Symmetry: C3
Subunit: 139 residues, 3 copies
Amino acid sequence: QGNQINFTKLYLHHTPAGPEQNQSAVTSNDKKIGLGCIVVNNWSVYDGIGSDAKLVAYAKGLHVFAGAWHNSFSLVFEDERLKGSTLQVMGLIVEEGDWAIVGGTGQFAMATGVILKKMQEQKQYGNIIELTIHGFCPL
Amino acid sequence: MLVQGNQINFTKLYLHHTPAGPEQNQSAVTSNDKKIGLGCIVVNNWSVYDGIGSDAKLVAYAKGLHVFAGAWHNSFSLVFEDERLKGSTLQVMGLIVEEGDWAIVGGTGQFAMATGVILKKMQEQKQYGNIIELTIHGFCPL
Amino acid sequence: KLQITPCGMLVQGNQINFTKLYLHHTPAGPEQNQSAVTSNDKKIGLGCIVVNNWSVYDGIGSDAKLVAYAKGLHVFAGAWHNSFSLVFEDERLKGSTLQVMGLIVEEGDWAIVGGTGQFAMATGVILKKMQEQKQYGNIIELTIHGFCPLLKGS
Ligand SMILES: [Ca+2]
Ligand SMILES: [Cl-]
Ligand SMILES: [Cl-]
Ligand SMILES: [Cl-]
Ligand SMILES: [Cl-]
Ligand SMILES: [Cl-]
């Protein structure tokens, strides 16, 4: 009938360059049209900032540049409490704005909600994005 | 039990699907495999207008991709441009570009957690593209 | 025109009741039904995109009637992430689709993220169980659990 979501703040490592690069462009923009670059991403997601943070999930999917980045990815949890579960995520922009939680699996079967993105830290080779998960699942 | 929300009905939107020509608004970045007959991937930034006439205002973009798997499977963000609806999106997924239906699989902003369908009907067939009438039927929980 | 109308929704309004389906995942051979169209980046270990038109049957015998196709793509980002339309063939179910998205082709689970026609607003999951491994592909058993909500109020 309704159960909300019990997360703290997550921090996604969006790293396009450097020796820890976790995404790759597989097509280029059409120069005439101004779109078409497709990037495939395996973004690590941590439970905090700093060397003591634990990796709790990966964001595995793709984003395509259609004048802005459209995303589709599986948020696959690795921490023991949620291992076996995913949230399915889709929407616009990587580093700010919102994404939609369009479904899920495991403990998140039938999840619906949103993920709010805020810039947390800009590093040399990438950035860290604060994720705030709001949503619910039916019981 | 029940989830309080708002049913959302949006009529008379017109999507400009323009594969070619000076107003081309999508690009194929892969080709169909010769032997299997599938594989073309097209990235699209389709404009969506509030009317068919000369005075129609652009009110959204459909930003995403579609892939040819014997028919075209679509995944995109319908991003609204009205300073009113600014930022808010509907997340759209499904088969066929010019006819049939798409699923509304989620949303953001004023359309957070949207669920529903988009109905497509071709309105005008032109030399380099077509105009597709869209009808949105959706529900957003509060 | 944008019409915003107060309404109620019951999620368990209409359960999606199917029998078991059987998906044919065939990467090679004379019945190959998918193609890889981008390459993995060797430096990063990800990037390959495959476009698929998987056939789906209602049984494992020769008299199994094809009832659907799974039309979409999967992308390798350390694991295969899937996005496809499940397009049904039979009359009454003609035109109707389930929208499916999630990780892994042959095991685990997928989300039902939406639908059209009779499956408008579908929500749920598809469980995958390996059913048979053949020379050019495998057959995957599909178990559908989900609901279509009914709207009320207004
Ligand atoms: Ca959904
Ligand atoms: Cl990026
Ligand atoms: Cl963007
Ligand atoms: Cl082609
Ligand atoms: Cl089509
Ligand atoms: Cl996999």
